[PDB]
Amino acid sequence: SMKIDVVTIFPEYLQPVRQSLPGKAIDAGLVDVAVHDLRRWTHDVHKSVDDSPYGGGPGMVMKPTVWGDALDEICTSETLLVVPTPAGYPFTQETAWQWSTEDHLVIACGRYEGIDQRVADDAATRMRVREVSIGDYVLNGGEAAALVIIEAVLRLVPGVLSLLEGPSYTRPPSWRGMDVPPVLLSGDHAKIAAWRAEQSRQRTIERRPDLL
């Protein structure tokens, strides 16, 4: 089984991924995704989750006292705490494979300038913590990144959900003046494999020369 807890000030953001879980996987106890409103752990009548940054500058920083309480309740010694942030280590397919065998992921979704660093520092003294970035761009908060991480990980858990791949084709054989490459209809499967390899090579050269 894998349990995923997501903590966010926008719990509705995560509701469609919850529903996208096949019933057969839930009934089999293979997966459970739970979403938690961070404001459940606020201390004041205004339900404050952020405050101005020490050292000045623009934006707001999320409060350590609120996050500390939330993680204290939700995390255990076995938890892998995932913190999506544009300042993180890169989240890659290798990461997704590694995390796919975890028993318990907690994903802490921050907003804007981030979560007070002492939250991660404190958590790391009693569980594993991973701050990660899903790409070289900035979003307004961690929620969309959490969706990407949840999907990339869970599709690698049985029954739950190099070079670039080249182009794919299906019927009809001719469409708006363009024919499917005849080699694909040749029945020469060694040649097809070689053709696909060359298409992959060319596409990787053009789009992702970093991979070579």
**Least distance between a second copy and beta carbon 183 (Å):** 7
- What region does 48 belong to: left with phi over 0, alpha with psi -120 to 50, or beta? beta
Rounded Cα distance, 55 and 20, in Å = 43
Does 189 sit near a second copy (CB under 8 A)?
yes
Q: Tell the residue number behind the tokens 């919850």, with chain if given.
A: 18
Scanning 26-34, 35-43, 75-83, 184-192 for contacts with a second copy by CB under 8 A, the matching segment is: 184-192
Q: Which is nearer to ligand JAE, 88 or 181 (CB)?
A: 88
Does 11 sit near ligand JAE (CB under 6 A)?
no
The residues, ordered by sequence, that sit 6+ positions from 48 with a Cβ below 8 Å of its Cβ are 42, 63, 66
Does 138 sit near ligand JAE (CB under 6 A)?
yes
- Residue 33 in 3-state DSSP? strand
**Least distance between a second copy and beta carbon 146 (Å):** 10
Q: Of 13, 31, 71, 114, which one interacts with ligand JAE (CB under 6 A)?
A: 114
Q: Of 1, 76, 101, 117, which one interacts with a second copy (CB under 8 A)?
A: 117
69 is in an annotated binding site: no
Q: Of 126, 175, 197, 205, which one interacts with a second copy (CB under 8 A)?
A: 175
Does 20 sit near a second copy (CB under 8 A)?
yes
**Alpha-carbon torsion, ordered 166, 167, 173, 175, to 10 deg:** -160
Cis peptide before 158 (omega within 30 of 0): no
DSSP-H helix ranges across the chain: 15-19, 23-27, 64-74, 93-99, 117-123, 143-154, 189-207
Does 65 sit near a second copy (CB under 8 A)?
yes
Q: Which is nearer to ligand JAE, 11 or 142 (CB)?
A: 142
Q: Which is nearer to ligand JAE, 31 or 107 (CB)?
A: 107
